[PDB]
Amino acid sequence: XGCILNGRTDLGTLLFRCRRDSDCPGACICRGNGYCG
Fold this sequence. Notes:
It is classed as protein binding, de novo protein. The entry lists the keywords cancer, imaging, protein binding, DE novo protein. The protein is largely without helices or strands. It has one domain (about 1-35). The protein is about 0% helix and about 10% strand. Strands 1-2 form a two-stranded antiparallel sheet. The protein is globular, with a radius of gyration of 8 Å. The chain starts with about 30 loop residues before the first strand and ends with a strand.
């Protein structure tokens, strides 16, 4: 796989519309892209 670390990126609500960078415990992060890029 995903964006390094984190508990398996793109899973539940984090799958998209990243509710917040908090949903991205790994390398990726919540951006305007509408998800934890």
